[PDB]
Coordinates of C-alpha atoms and ligand atoms in Angstrom, one line a residue:
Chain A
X14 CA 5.5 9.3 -25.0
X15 CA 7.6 9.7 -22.2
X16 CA 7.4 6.1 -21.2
X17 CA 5.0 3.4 -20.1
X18 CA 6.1 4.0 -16.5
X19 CA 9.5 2.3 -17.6
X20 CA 12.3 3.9 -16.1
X21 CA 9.7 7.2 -15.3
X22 CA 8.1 5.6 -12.0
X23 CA 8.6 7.1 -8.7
X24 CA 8.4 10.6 -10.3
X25 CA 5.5 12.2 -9.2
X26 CA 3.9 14.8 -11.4
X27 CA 3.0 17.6 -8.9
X28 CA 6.4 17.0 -7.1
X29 CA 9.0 15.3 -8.7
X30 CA 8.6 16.5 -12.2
X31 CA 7.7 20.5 -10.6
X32 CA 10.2 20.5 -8.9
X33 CA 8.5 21.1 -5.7
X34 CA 9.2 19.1 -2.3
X35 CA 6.5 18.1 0.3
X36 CA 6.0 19.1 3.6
X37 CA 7.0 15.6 5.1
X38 CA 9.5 15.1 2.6
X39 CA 12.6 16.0 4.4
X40 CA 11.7 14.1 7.3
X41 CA 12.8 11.1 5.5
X42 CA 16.3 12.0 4.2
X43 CA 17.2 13.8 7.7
X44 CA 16.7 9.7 8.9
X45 CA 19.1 8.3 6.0
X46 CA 21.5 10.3 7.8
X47 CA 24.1 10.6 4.7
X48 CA 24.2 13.6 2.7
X49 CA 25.2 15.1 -0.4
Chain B
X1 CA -3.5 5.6 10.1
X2 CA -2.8 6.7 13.5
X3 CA -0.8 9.6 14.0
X4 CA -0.6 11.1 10.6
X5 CA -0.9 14.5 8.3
X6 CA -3.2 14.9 5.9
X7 CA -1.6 13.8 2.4
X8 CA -1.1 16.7 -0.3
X9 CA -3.1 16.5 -3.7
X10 CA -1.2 14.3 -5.3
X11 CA 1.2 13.4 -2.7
X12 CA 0.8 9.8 -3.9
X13 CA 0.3 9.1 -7.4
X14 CA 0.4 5.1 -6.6
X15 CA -2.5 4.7 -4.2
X16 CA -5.0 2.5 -5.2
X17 CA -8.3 1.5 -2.9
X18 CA -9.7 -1.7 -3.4
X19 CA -13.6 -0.8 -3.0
X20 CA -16.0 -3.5 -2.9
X21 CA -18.9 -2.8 -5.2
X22 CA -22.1 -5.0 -3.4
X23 CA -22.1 -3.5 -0.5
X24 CA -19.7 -0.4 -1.8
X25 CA -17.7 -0.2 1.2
X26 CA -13.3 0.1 1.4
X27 CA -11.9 -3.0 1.6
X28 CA -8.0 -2.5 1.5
X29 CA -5.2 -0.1 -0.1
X30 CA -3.4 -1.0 -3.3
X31 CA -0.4 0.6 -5.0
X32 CA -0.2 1.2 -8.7
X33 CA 3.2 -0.5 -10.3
X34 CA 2.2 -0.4 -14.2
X35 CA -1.1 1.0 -16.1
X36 CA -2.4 -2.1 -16.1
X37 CA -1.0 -3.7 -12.5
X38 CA -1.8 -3.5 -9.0
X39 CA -0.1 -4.9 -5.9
X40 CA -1.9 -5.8 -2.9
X41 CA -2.0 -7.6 0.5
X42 CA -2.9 -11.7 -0.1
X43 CA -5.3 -11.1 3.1
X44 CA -7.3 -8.7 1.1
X45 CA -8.6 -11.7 -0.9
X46 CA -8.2 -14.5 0.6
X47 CA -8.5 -15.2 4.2
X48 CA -10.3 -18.2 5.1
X49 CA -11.2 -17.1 9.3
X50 CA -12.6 -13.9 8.6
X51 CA -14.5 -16.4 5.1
X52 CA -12.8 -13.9 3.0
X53 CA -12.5 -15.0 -0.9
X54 CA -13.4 -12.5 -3.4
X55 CA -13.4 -12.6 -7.2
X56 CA -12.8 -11.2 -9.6
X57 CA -16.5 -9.8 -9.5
X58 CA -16.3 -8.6 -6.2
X59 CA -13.6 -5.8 -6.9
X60 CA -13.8 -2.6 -8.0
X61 CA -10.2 -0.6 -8.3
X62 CA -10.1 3.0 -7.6
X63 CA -7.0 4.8 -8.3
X64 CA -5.7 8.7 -8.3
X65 CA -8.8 9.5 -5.5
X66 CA -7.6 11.7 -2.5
X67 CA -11.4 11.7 -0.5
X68 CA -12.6 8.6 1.4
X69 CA -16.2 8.4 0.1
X70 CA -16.7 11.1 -2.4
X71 CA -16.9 10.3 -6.2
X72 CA -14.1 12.1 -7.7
X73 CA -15.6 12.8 -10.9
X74 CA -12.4 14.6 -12.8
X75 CA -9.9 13.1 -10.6
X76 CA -10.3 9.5 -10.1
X77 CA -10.5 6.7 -12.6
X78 CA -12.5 3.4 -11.8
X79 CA -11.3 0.4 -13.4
X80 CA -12.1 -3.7 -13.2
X81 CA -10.3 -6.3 -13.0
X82 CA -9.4 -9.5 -15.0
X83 CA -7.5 -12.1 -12.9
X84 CA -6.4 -12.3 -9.4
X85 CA -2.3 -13.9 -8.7
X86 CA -2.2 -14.7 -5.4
X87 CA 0.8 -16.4 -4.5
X88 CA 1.1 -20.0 -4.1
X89 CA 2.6 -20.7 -0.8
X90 CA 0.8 -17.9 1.2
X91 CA 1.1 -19.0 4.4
X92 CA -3.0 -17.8 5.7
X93 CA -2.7 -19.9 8.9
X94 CA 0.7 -19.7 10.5
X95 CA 2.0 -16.2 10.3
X96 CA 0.3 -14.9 7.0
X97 CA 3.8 -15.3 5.6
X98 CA 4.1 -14.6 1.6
X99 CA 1.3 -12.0 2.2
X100 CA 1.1 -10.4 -1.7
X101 CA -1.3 -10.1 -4.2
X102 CA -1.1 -8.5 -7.8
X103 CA -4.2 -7.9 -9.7
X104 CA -4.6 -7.8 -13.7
X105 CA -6.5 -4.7 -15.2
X106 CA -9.0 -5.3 -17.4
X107 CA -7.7 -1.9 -19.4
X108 CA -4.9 -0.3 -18.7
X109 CA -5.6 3.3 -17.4
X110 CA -5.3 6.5 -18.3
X111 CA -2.7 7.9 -16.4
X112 CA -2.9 11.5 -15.5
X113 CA -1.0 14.0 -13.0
X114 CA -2.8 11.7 -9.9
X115 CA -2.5 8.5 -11.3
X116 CA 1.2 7.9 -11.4
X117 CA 2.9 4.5 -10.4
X118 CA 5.6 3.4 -8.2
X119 CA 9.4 1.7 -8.4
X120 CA 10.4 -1.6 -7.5
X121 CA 13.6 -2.1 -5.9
X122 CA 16.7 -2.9 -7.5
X123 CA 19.1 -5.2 -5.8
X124 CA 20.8 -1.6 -4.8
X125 CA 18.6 0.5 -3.9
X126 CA 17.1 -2.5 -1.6
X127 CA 20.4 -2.8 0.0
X128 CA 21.2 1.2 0.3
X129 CA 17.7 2.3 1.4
X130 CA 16.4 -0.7 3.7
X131 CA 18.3 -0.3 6.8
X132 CA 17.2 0.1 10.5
X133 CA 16.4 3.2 11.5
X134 CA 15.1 4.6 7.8
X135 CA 11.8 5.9 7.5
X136 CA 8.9 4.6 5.1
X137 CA 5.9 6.7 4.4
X138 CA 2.8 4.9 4.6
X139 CA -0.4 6.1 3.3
X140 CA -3.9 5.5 3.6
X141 CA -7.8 5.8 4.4
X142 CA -8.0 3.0 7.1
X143 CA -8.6 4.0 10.6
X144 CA -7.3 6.6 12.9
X145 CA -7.9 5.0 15.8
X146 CA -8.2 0.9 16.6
X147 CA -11.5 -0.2 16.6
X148 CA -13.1 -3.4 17.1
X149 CA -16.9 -2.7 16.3
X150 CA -15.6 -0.4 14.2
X151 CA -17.2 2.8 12.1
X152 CA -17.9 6.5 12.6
X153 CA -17.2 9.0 15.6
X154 CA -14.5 10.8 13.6
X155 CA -12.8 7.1 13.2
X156 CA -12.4 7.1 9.6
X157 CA -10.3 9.7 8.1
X158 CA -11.9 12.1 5.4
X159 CA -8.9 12.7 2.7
X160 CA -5.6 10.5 2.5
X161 CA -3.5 10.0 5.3
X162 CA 0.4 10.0 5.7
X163 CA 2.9 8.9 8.3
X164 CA 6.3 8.4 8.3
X165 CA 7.7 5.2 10.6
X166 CA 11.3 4.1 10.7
X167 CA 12.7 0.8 10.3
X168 CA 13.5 -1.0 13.3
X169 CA 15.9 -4.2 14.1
X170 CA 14.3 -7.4 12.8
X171 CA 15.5 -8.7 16.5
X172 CA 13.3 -5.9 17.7
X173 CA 10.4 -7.2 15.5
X174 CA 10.8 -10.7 16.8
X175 CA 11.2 -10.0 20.4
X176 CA 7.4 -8.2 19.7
X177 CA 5.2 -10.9 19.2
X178 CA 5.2 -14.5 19.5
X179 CA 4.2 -15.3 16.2
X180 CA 6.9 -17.1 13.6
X181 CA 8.6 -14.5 11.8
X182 CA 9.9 -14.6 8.5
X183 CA 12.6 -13.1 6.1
X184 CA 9.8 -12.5 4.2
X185 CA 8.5 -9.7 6.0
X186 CA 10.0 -7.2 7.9
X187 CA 8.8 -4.6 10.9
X188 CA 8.6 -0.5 11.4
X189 CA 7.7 1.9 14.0
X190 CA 8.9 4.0 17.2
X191 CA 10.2 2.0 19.6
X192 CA 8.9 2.3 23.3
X193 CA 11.2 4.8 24.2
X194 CA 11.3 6.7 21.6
X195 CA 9.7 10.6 21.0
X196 CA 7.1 10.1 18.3
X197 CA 3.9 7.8 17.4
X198 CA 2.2 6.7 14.7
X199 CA 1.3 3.4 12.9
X200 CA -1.2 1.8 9.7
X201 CA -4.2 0.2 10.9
X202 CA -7.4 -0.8 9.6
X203 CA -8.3 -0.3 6.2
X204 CA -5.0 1.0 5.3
X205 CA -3.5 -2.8 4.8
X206 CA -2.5 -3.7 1.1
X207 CA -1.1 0.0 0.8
X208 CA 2.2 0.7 0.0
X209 CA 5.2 1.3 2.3
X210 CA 7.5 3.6 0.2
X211 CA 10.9 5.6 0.7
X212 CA 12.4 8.0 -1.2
X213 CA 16.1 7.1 -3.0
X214 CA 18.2 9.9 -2.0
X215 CA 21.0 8.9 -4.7
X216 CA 18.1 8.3 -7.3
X217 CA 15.0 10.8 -6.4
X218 CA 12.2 8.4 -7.7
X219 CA 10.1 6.5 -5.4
X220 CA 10.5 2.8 -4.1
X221 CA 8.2 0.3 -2.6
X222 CA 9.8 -1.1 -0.2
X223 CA 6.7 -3.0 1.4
X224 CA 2.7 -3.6 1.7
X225 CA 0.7 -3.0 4.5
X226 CA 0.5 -6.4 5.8
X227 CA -0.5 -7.1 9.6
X228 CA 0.0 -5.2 12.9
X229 CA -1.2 -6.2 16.5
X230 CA -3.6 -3.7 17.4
X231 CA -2.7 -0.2 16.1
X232 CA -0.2 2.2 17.7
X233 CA 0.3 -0.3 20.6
X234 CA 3.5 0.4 22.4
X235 CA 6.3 -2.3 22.2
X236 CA 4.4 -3.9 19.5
X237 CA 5.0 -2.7 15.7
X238 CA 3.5 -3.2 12.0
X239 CA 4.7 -5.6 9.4
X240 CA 4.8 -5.4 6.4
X241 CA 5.6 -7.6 3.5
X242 CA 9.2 -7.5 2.2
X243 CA 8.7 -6.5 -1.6
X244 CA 12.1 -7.2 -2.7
X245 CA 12.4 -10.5 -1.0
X246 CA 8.9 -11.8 -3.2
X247 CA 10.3 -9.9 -6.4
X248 CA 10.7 -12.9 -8.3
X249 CA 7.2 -13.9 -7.9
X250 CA 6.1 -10.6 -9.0
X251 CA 8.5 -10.8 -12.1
X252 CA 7.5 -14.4 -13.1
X253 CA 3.9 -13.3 -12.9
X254 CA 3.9 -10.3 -15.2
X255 CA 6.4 -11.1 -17.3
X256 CA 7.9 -8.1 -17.6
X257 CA 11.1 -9.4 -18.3
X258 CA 14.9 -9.4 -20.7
X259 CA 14.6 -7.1 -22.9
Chain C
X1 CA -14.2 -2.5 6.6
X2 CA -18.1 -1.3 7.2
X3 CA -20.4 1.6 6.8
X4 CA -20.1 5.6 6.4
X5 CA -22.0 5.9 3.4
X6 CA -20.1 6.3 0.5
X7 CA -21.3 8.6 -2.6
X8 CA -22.6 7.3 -6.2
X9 CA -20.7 5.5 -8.9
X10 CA -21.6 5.1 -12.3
X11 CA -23.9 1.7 -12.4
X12 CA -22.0 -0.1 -15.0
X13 CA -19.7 -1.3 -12.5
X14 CA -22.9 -2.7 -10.8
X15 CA -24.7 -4.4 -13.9
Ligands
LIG301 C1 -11.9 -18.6 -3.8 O1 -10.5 -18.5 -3.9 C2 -9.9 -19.6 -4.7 C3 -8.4 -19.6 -4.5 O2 -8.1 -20.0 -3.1 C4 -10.4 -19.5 -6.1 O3 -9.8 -20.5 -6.9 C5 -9.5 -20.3 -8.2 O4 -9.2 -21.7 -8.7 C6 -8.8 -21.7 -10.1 C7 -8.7 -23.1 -10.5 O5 -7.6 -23.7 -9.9 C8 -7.6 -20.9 -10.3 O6 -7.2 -20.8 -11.7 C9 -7.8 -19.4 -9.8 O7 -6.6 -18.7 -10.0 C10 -8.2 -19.4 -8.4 N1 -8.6 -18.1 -7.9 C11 -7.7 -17.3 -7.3 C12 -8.2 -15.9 -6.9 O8 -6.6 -17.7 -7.0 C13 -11.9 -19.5 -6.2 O9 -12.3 -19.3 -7.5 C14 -12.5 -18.5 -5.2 N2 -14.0 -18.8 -5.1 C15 -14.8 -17.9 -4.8 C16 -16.3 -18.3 -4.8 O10 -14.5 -16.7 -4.6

């Protein structure tokens, strides 16, 4: 398996793990301020 | 929840609603931490004024659904539970401090692309992430509008909602209300001044309070749904419970330890 | 917390 949630939570499977963002994602980092 | 977008299909992998079965109605929000765990609100069970004190054959879980009433035959899995760990020194009467719940599965589920638990916070990412100002998103069916004799006239939101509060200054939070605040639970939302709304409210409590890591990309809870005073009120804002400040209990109750 | 009908569930839940 790939876990059993382990290490592998947090990772949504239509986002996270497809690479795809969602519409109020963004919204959140912009408010952490710091960037990479 | 007041002010929000309607959540994506499978925007949150973690929700979890905690349906009662006799008469089927919503009760609270839950969040999904393991297959066979799920955190909630102590209120949500036990709450002597309103004469609330469910058992174990009250409950009915539903996790990965995305509609408020309709039976998500391919989508959603229903599952019952086995015990109930409420923590000891919940403090029901005072200022519902220690306001956390964690229900046993009786089977752990089958997790599929909508069923997909949540992080914990690790003594960093608690540190890093939980600062004023941050935004949480906070999810859930409850109302979209405070009601007091509450039910239908568009009230009750048809799919899941999402809103994303900030963090404000816990001597912001205390200067709110009068009631004995804690370290054990901590506030968000806009201030007065301030150019946006939003805020959980009714049938949304027990759901999780998330944030992204932006040094890690998983998901963290950072808090549940706990209480509010009146919802969307300006100069008054929702707590919720501090998950990382009550991880120990959590820990010592699953067990889920060095290894 | 009340009543907008909510759609059937599989009565082995119930008895
Ligand atoms: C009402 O809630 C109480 C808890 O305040 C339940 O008490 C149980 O008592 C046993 C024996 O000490 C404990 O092992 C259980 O863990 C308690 N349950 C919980 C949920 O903590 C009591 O069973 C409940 N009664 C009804 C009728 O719901």
């Amino acid at each position: 398996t790939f876990g059993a949630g382990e290490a592998d939570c947090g990772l949504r499977p239509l986002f996270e793990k497809k690479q795809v963002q969602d519409q109020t994602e963004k919204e959140l980092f912009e408010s952490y301020i710091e960037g990479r | 929840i007041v002010e929000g977008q309607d959540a994506e299909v499978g925007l949150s992998p973690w929700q979890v609603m905690l349906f009662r079965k006799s008469p089927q109605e919503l009760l609270c929000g839950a969040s999904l931490i393991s297959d066979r765990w799920v955190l909630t609100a102590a209120h949500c069970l036990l709450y002597p004024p309103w004469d609330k004190n469910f058992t174990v054959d009250d409950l009915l879980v539903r996790i990965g659904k995305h509609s408020r009433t309709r039976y998500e035959r391919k989508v959603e899995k229903i599952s019952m539970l086995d015990k109930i760990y409420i923590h000891p020194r919940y403090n029901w009467k005072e200022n519902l401090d220690r306001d956390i719940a964690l229900l046993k599965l009786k089977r752990p589920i089958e997790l599929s692309d909508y069923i997909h638990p949540v992080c914990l916070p690790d003594k960093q990412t608690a540190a890093k992430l939980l600062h004023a100002g941050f935004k949480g998103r906070v999810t859930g069916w409850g109302n979209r509008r405070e009601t007091w004799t509450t039910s239908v006239a568009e009230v009750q939101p048809s799919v899941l909602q999402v809103v994303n509060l900030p963090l404000v200054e816990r001597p912001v939070c205390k200067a709110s209300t009068r009631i004995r605040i804690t370290d054990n639970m901590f506030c968000a939302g806009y201030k007065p001044g301030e150019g946006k709304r939003g805020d959980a409210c009714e049938g949304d409590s027990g759901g999780p309070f998330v944030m992204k890591s932006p040094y890690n990309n998983r998901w963290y809870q950072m808090g549940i749904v706990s209480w509010g005073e009146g919802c969307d009120r300006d100069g008054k804002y929702g707590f919720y419970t501090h998950v990382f400040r009550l991880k120990k209990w959590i820990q010592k109750v699953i067990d889920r330890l060095g290894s | 917390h009340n009543d907008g009908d909510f759609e059937e569930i599989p009565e082995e839940y119930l008895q």
